[PDB]
Design a protein around this ligand. Structure first.
Ligand SMILES: O[C@H]1[C@H]2c3cc4c(cc3CN3CCC(=C[C@@H]1O)[C@H]23)OCO4
Ligand SMILES: [Mg+2]
Ligand SMILES: [Mg+2]
Ligand SMILES: [Mg+2]
Ligand SMILES: [Mg+2]
Ligand SMILES: [Mg+2]
Ligand SMILES: [Mg+2]
Ligand SMILES: [Mg+2]
Ligand SMILES: [Mg+2]
Ligand SMILES: [Mg+2]
Ligand SMILES: [Mg+2]
Ligand SMILES: [Mg+2]
Ligand SMILES: [Mg+2]
Ligand SMILES: [Mg+2]
Ligand SMILES: [Mg+2]
Ligand SMILES: [Mg+2]
Ligand SMILES: [Mg+2]
Ligand SMILES: [Mg+2]
Ligand SMILES: [Mg+2]
Ligand SMILES: [Mg+2]
Ligand SMILES: [Mg+2]
Ligand SMILES: [Mg+2]
Ligand SMILES: [Mg+2]
Ligand SMILES: [Mg+2]
Ligand SMILES: [Mg+2]
Ligand SMILES: [Mg+2]
Ligand SMILES: [Mg+2]
Ligand SMILES: [Mg+2]
Ligand SMILES: [Mg+2]
Ligand SMILES: [Mg+2]
Ligand SMILES: [Mg+2]
Ligand SMILES: [Mg+2]
Ligand SMILES: [Mg+2]
Ligand SMILES: [Mg+2]
Ligand SMILES: [Mg+2]
Ligand SMILES: [Mg+2]
Ligand SMILES: [Mg+2]
Ligand SMILES: [Mg+2]
Ligand SMILES: [Mg+2]
Ligand SMILES: [Mg+2]
Ligand SMILES: [Mg+2]
Ligand SMILES: [Mg+2]
Ligand SMILES: [Mg+2]
Ligand SMILES: [Mg+2]
Ligand SMILES: [Mg+2]
Ligand SMILES: [Mg+2]
Ligand SMILES: [Mg+2]
Ligand SMILES: [Mg+2]
Lengths: 172, 193, 197, 191, 136
RNA sequence: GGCCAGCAUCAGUUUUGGUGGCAGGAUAAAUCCAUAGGAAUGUAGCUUGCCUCGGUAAGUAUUAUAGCCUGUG
RNA sequence: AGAACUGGCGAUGCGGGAUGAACCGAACGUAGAGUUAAGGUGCCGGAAUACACGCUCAUCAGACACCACAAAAGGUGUUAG
RNA sequence: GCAGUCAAGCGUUCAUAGCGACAUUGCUUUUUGAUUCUUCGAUGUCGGCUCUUCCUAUCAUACCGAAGCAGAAUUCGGUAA
RNA sequence: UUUGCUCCACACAAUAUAGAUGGAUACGAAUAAGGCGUCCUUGUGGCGUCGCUGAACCAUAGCAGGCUAGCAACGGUGCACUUGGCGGAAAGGCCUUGGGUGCUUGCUGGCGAAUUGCAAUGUCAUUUUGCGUGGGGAUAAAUCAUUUGUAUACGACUUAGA
């Protein structure tokens, strides 16, 4: 749906005479802008409580920034999704440098592997897998082995003119 | 395959010389009369051609012609033609060729008894020919309006086009044919009662 | 850039080599292409062989002459790929095509001239390593082309002579570099360095 | 998922030097020398020490990796092939017509010439591949033996002899007639 | 009769491999690989050169043959400490790469007149080399 | 002053660059600095076992002869 | 084949969907400059052989609404759960 | 009209050699219907004769796999027009 | 048939142009590997070095490039000659020898340039042909009609005729 920011959204059931000061609920929401974020909020909220936007009020919206944006991190990701023929819970693991990058590629992955578009996906939980060896998916574990090194074989340099006078070479 | 030179013998029988023309009697008979001159100077020009052939040349064919005067035909104008030369080695081949210039080659030197040979020729002609004999289509019944040596259905309605694959009146005969496996039962000799 | 651009077909992908050759013409650039027998097509040999027979069955029912023509030669397989990318039924189209020449091997003129390449169609830069692909010459020879062996013979001959040329040249250029070096450290030489040379 | 690297070892024994440039492999030991083209496959060889060579695949999928081992093996069987060497054993099998098997030569040939198969007046022929040598076993009834340095060449020559003796138009369960491969192994013994 | 087995000797992605960035506000700038994220992303950092600590695609970077000692996941100040200490800049600078980069940047800052002087010089050199190329 | 142009200063419309000053927010989040605590894909040292005179491995071992993480300021 | 509400075609060209009454965009005096729609940008053909992460190898691969079809059932092909 | 999936049965024994109920998913357009879009200022509105070409859901012939294939004979299936 | 043909040379005249405007600047082969230098045991060899683009290399100053002088070099280069040789895939081009000759911006000099008026492609290419001039060279055929029948509806084909 684009390039996400994470937002704390807070809403609460429009006050009333017999109930001034209703209860206040928060959601963290990955959206590309605050407008979509407030929409999503109401979307899941009417999925949990008896409210809808009509009778309720957004109280506060705040972007949350990554705590350590240049720290590499192992993300455990939890998702609910709809397939063509049914709906499905699912756990993936993503390694990147911020919860916001991570959710970008999840949506990418869900779309690429399961043909899940944004409408049809639900983030259950994104959280930092602290101790390695509670990392479970191999395609991640692979990148924790000590003194990791790999070549990047068969190099393709992009030509900037149409013709070339050489014959290239993919050494690297 | 492309031809890259033709070397010619110094003298040339009127028989072949005649082939190079459509009106012999009026003509100044000038054919090959400059080429012949190429022998004069020691040999120079002819050799380098021969020489060239040897260097390149994947195949070699000899220019031969018939002695039609030794033949009861009227037609005087002899026949000339290329014959490939299979005996070994390009260089040996042209030496053979060069050697036989103006000299004369015999059948027994080419064919033996019981040998299977092929015959290449232009078929007898019959001119414009109806479908029934040209293709051996069925005669149509005797009752049929406007002719019966025909084909009833020259095609379905679609392709709305007569097609290349159906019998149609036209020329018959005077076709080229390459006929194989004719066996030599005799190689006769002229000088031989 | 240059009056004529000679392209070593070898190791290029037909429809990418085509797609650039076409544009080049339409923009006024004369082109010759060589070694079209050493041209490539993605997909294993069998796939493109099957593809080619598809092409083979198309023909004018009433008369197989009016119908689609099938050229078997590698240059000519190429030209088909190319012509289809050119509005070849317009003056402007007929014009552009005439700036084009395709050839199996490298026949005279073009063998003493330099040939270039087209990286955005070079196979080794384009195909994912691992994918099966096809050589024009072998494909053509499978559908009728009569002249693979001869081209190969003539080429090996050509490749020899050119190896002499090169060697001869690499010799001379060694001397040049030697000379070019005993002039290093001189004033003129240091001055040029200063100015980027 | 693409594995960032998986690899294998190829041991080298005391008699042989294997030498590999681009992916053209040459193995040379006591029994001679074979060579085999691996260009079609995209692995990286590395010598670690005269008795050890590694083969690895960087950032590869299943089907890729899954060819790394068959590379390790193909190159092993060259090294075993050039030390011990290979020997395939085949026995004739027939239930009435004796299968007459000879070796004949036209123009340097060497051909396995099978006659009287299930009676057949027809005379069968299988060419002897180069590298491979045929010895009709003494002391064993109807045993042919193909031996050589290439597993691939004997195994194939073997399979060519066996297949030339397929049976048609009969229940090939009752008609078991043939020349079958009955033992695969080595030339040099105690092993 | 040893065995002789090629090589194929790739520059590797590894903590402390220095790369020359190619797209973006940095670009032309060197930098060190600090941690490694996946097959296609690494965390880079290049304080000496100005380039911010960031996550980057490998696709936009080109591995150099240079490497120094860096602890995986070392922070910017630490990186600056090792870098200087391992003297990578002089090392890079000395290379043909960097020297060739420098060359063409000069070629492209030449004045028209400077350009003119370049030719007068090449003429000068040509005269004496062409000679020597004719006396042995 | 007939024809067609070039440049300059402006007017209407528009397009494409450079650059200056400010406002928000966790009065951005980081880096950095300070400080407390920690752990391993465990840095020094140490022990032990082979091993061409140290190099390896498998133990201890939380800053030492690398560093990192986490909170607070 | 027959009704309901609206919007259309009929009566209407223009851009897009190769093509096409009705779909998409947009409704028309004669023109300049700009900007867009729907739809596109390898070449045909104006416009990135752009960027980015995955997936897919088909000895009948696939390739954009209306639209020019495919189903049950299976695969130790491969992907992620 | 033709071809499937499930597999209860059939096949002495034995679901699937060869078959296959109750169900059920399809394909075809030489059947017949349903429609009424084109032709009513006219598209010669049975069949046969002739003659071409094309499809394949293959009767024969080439080479194969399978069988409740001993041989002979047959049946099932593949590549095949 | 009114002195015609051809090749080289120049000259006038036309006619064009799918588009000159410093240079199409030659190994091959591999790409999970190469190029170049060097050594040696000449090999799937040792060692060194390069790539990360042709953004290069070469050429490039002078009335669109005039007229002149000199020096240092003995190099470069244009042109017509001559020596030996190689190239047949479409070779029709490449290399080499030797004198002659022009130029040289390798360096240092004398003279010139304006008024094309503040820009106007400001005209420098190469296509094909036509007409005289004189320097080499060469002196046919086909067709109709006639005729044959190995051919033929007519044309066409195949023969024949000083
Ligand atoms: O022409 C008409 C039909 C027709 C009318 C006739 C007639 C024969 C036909 C032939 N039918 C084929 C298809 C056709 C379409 C038309 O309806 C024709 O004989 C007397 O009138
Ligand atoms: Mg946070
Ligand atoms: Mg000639
Ligand atoms: Mg008659
Ligand atoms: Mg008949
Ligand atoms: Mg007859
Ligand atoms: Mg009648
Ligand atoms: Mg008939
Ligand atoms: Mg059978
Ligand atoms: Mg039987
Ligand atoms: Mg004007
Ligand atoms: Mg203005
Ligand atoms: Mg600003
Ligand atoms: Mg360290
Ligand atoms: Mg509507
Ligand atoms: Mg009406
Ligand atoms: Mg309208
Ligand atoms: Mg339109
Ligand atoms: Mg459409
Ligand atoms: Mg087109
Ligand atoms: Mg375009
Ligand atoms: Mg762009
Ligand atoms: Mg849809
Ligand atoms: Mg399914
Ligand atoms: Mg599956
Ligand atoms: Mg049941
Ligand atoms: Mg049973
Ligand atoms: Mg039963
Ligand atoms: Mg029917
Ligand atoms: Mg009617
Ligand atoms: Mg009518
Ligand atoms: Mg009709
Ligand atoms: Mg009628
Ligand atoms: Mg078909
Ligand atoms: Mg079938
Ligand atoms: Mg049974
Ligand atoms: Mg079968
Ligand atoms: Mg048929
Ligand atoms: Mg067919
Ligand atoms: Mg023109
Ligand atoms: Mg090297
Ligand atoms: Mg060398
Ligand atoms: Mg070496
Ligand atoms: Mg260069
Ligand atoms: Mg001058
Ligand atoms: Mg040519
Ligand atoms: Mg001067
Ligand atoms: Mg004259």
């Amino acid at each position: 749906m684009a390039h996400f920011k994470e937002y704390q959204v807070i809403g609460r059931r429009l006050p009333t005479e017999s109930v001034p000061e209703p209860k206040l609920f928060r959601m963290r929401i990955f959206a590309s802008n605050e407008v979509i974020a407030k929409s999503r909020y109401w979307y899941f909220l009417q999925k949990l409580h008896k409210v809808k936007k009509a009778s309720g009020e957004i109280v506060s919206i705040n972007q949350i920034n990554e705590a350590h944006p240049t720290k590499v991190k192992n993300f455990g990701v939890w998702v609910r999704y709809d397939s063509r023929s049914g709906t499905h819970n699912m756990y993936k693991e993503i390694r990147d440098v911020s919860r916001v990058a991570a959710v970008e590629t999840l949506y990418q992955d869900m779309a690429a592997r399961h043909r899940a578009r944004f409408r049809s996906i639900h983030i259950l939980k994104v959280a930092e897998i602290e101790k390695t060896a509670d990392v479970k998916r191999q395609y991640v574990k692979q990148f924790l082995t000590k003194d990791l090194k790999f070549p990047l074989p068969h190099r393709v340099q992009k030509s900037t003119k149409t013709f070339s006078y050489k014959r290239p070479s993919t050494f690297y | 395959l492309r031809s890259l030179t033709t070397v010619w013998a110094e003298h040339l029988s009127d028989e072949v010389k005649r082939r190079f023309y459509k009106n012999w009697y009026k003509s100044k008979k000038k054919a090959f009369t400059k080429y012949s001159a190429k022998y004069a100077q020691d040999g120079a020009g002819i050799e380098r051609e021969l020489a060239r052939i040897k260097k390149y040349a994947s195949v070699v064919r000899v220019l031969v012609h018939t002695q039609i005067r030794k033949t009861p035909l009227a037609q005087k104008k002899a026949h000339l033609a290329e014959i490939q030369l299979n005996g070994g080695s390009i260089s040996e081949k042209v030496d053979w060729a060069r050697e036989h210039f103006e000299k004369t080659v015999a059948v027994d030197s080419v064919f033996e008894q019981n040998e299977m040979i092929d015959a290449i020729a232009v078929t007898k002609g019959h001119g414009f020919e109806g479908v029934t004999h040209r293709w051996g289509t069925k005669k149509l019944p005797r009752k049929t309006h406007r002719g019966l040596r025909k084909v009833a259905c020259i095609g379905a309605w679609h392709p709305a086009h007569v097609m290349w694959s159906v019998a149609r009146a036209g020329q018959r005969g005077y076709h080229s044919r390459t006929s194989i496996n004719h066996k030599i039962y005799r190689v006769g000799k002229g000088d031989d009662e | 850039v240059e009056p004529v651009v000679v392209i070593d077909g070898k190791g290029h992908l037909v429809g990418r080599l085509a797609s650039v050759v076409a544009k080049q013409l339409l923009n006024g650039q004369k082109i010759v292409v060589v070694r079209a027998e050493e041209l490539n097509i993605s997909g294993e040999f069998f796939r493109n062989k099957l593809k080619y027979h598809d092409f083979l069955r198309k023909a004018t029912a009433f008369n197989k002459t009016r119908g689609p023509f099938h050229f078997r030669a590698p240059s000519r397989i190429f030209y088909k790929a190319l012509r289809g990318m050119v509005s070849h039924k317009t003056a402007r189209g007929k014009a552009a095509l005439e700036r084009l020449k395709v050839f199996e091997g490298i026949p005279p003129p073009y063998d003493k001239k330099k040939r270039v390449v087209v990286p955005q169609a070079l196979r080794v830069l384009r195909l994912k390593p691992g994918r099966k692909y096809t050589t024009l010459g072998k494909l053509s020879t499978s559908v009728g082309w009569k002249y693979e062996d001869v081209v190969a013979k003539l080429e090996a001959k050509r490749k020899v002579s050119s190896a002499e040329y090169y060697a001869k040249k690499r010799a001379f250029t060694k001397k040049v570099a030697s000379a070019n070096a005993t002039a290093a450290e001189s004033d003129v030489a240091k001055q040029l360095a200063a100015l980027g040379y | 998922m693409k594995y960032i690297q998986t690899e294998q070892q190829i041991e080298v024994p005391e008699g042989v030097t294997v030498s590999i440039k681009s992916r053209i492999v040459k193995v040379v030991g006591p029994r001679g020398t074979l060579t085999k083209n691996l260009k079609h496959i995209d692995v990286t060889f590395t010598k670690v020490n005269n008795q050890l060579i590694k083969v690895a695949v960087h950032n590869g999928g299943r089907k890729h990796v899954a060819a790394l081992r068959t590379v390790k093996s193909l190159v092993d069987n060259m090294i075993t092939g050039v030390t011990k060497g290979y020997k395939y054993k085949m026995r004739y099998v027939y239930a009435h017509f004796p299968i007459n098997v000879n070796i004949v030569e036209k123009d340097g040939a060497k051909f396995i010439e099978v006659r009287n198969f299930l009676g057949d007046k027809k005379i069968r022929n299988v060419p002897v591949r180069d590298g491979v040598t045929i010895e009709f076993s003494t002391n064993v009834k109807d045993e042919i033996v193909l031996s050589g340095n290439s597993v691939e060449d004997v195994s194939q020559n073997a399979a060519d002899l066996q297949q030339i003796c397929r049976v048609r138009n009969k229940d090939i369960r009752k008609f078991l007639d043939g020349i079958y491969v009955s033992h695969k192994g080595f030339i040099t013994e105690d092993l | 009769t040893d065995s002789i087995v090629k090589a194929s000797n790739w520059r590797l992605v590894e903590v402390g491999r220095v790369v020359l960035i190619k797209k973006g506000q940095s670009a032309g700038k060197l930098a060190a690989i600090v941690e490694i994220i996946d097959q296609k992303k690494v965390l880079i950092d290049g304080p000496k050169a100005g380039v911010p600590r960031q996550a980057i695609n490998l696709g936009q970077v080109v591995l150099t043959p240079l490497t120094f000692a860096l602890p995986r996941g070392a922070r910017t100040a630490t990186v600056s400490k090792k870098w200087a200490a391992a003297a990578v800049c002089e090392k890079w600078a000395a290379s043909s790469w960097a020297k060739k980069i420098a060359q063409r940047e000069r070629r492209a800052a030449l004045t028209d007149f400077e350009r003119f002087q370049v030719m007068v010089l090449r003429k000068q050199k040509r005269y004496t080399v062409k000679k020597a190329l004719a006396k042995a």
